[PDB]
Structure 1
């Protein structure tokens, strides 16, 4: 809500992760963004 009872989206829900290693950060970032891309593909499939 918006402090009264009318719905809003002031911010989007997100997760805060902290990384310490660089190779693993590169790998997790590339994997996650690739999953995001495949997900766009699957949602494109589903919205039809």
Structure 2
């Protein structure tokens, strides 16, 4: 319910489980069938996102820190500054996603204290 909730990740329906038993708190999206799985490291996550009341949807998105260690470049080896990649999980209930979101955010704020 809070540390776990069924979400859709890239149009596939599955489940989400934020677990802190683990190396820096991890979310684990495990498909409802148990086929595919996608784990998120909250510490590699810079920001977490979740639909506001103003939004017509209910969805989360965990933003991973962009790779500043080696700046990227374009086809000719110029230079580009990548926008941080993100992990979006779609929910069907704003309470659920509020529960999931609040769970992660607490972890994120936890890791920003130690960032």
TM-score bucket of the superposed structures, by smaller chain: 0.5 to 0.7
Alpha-carbon separation, structure 2, partners of 1:13 and 1:40: 18
CA distance in 1, matches of 2:111, 2:78: 31
Q: Compare the two structures and name the one with the higher strand fraction.
A: 2
Larger radius of gyration: 1
Deviation at 1:17, TM superposition (A): 1.4
16-25 or 30-39: bigger deviation: 16-25
Q: Which runs of 5+ in 1 are unaligned?
A: 44-48
Give the alignment's Cα RMSD to 1 decimal: 1.7
Q: TM-score, normalised by structure 1?
A: 0.63
Tell me the number of residue pairs that the alignment of Structure 1 and Structure 2 aligns: 43
State the alpha-carbon separation in 2 of the partners of residues 20 and 6 from structure 1: 43
1:28 aligns with 2:100: yes
Counterpart of 2:114 in structure 1 is 42
